[PDB]
């Protein structure tokens, strides 16, 4: 699965980016090279800082701060919904957002807190649709 693109007809691999995420998610599943624990409502989630900061303005802020980037444990606001966070973390590693009637408000609040603008805009659009 490859194709050509641009002024220099460079070869692009269609599945490369998704294959990288698949492999990063496999690392996460096996706890390989995870370098941070996120604590949400007394539940712990192991992850890779680079993936978190690639997806979230809040994590980008934290992990580019000279002081804060040395923490191996990051606590979130205790009002954040841990399912909401799990849904968003899974999205970071898969591109798949498991949005449902019963979780959309929690997901949207969590995505606001995490500064995940495209997810927030998507939640808003689904909410507007059901008004
Ligand atoms: N997480 C994960 N799982 C499986 N394989 C890899 N990387 C890899 C292994 C062999 C050849 C090419 C890539 N990463």
From Swiss-Prot:
<comment type="function">
    <text>Transcriptional repressor mainly required for germinal center (GC) formation and antibody affinity maturation which has different mechanisms of action specific to the lineage and biological functions. Forms complexes with different corepressors and histone deacetylases to repress the transcriptional expression of different subsets of target genes. Represses its target genes by binding directly to the DNA sequence 5'-TTCCTAGAA-3' (BCL6-binding site) or indirectly by repressing the transcriptional activity of transcription factors.</text>
</comment>
<protein>
    <recommendedName>
        <fullName>B-cell lymphoma 6 protein</fullName>
    </recommendedName>
</protein>
<comment type="subunit">
    <text>Homodimer. Interacts (via BTB domain) with the corepressors BCOR, NCOR1 and SMRT/NCOR2; the interactions are direct. Forms preferably ternary complexes with BCOR and SMRT/NCOR2 on target gene promoters but, on enhancer elements, interacts with SMRT/NCOR2 and HDAC3 to repress proximal gene expression. Interacts with histone deacetylases HDAC2, HDAC5 and HDAC9 (via the catalytic domain). Interacts with ZBTB7 and BCL6B. Interacts with SCF(FBXO11) complex; the interaction is independent of phosphorylation and promotes ubiquitination.</text>
</comment>
<feature type="domain" description="BTB">
    <location>
        <begin position="34"/>
        <end position="101"/>
    </location>
</feature>
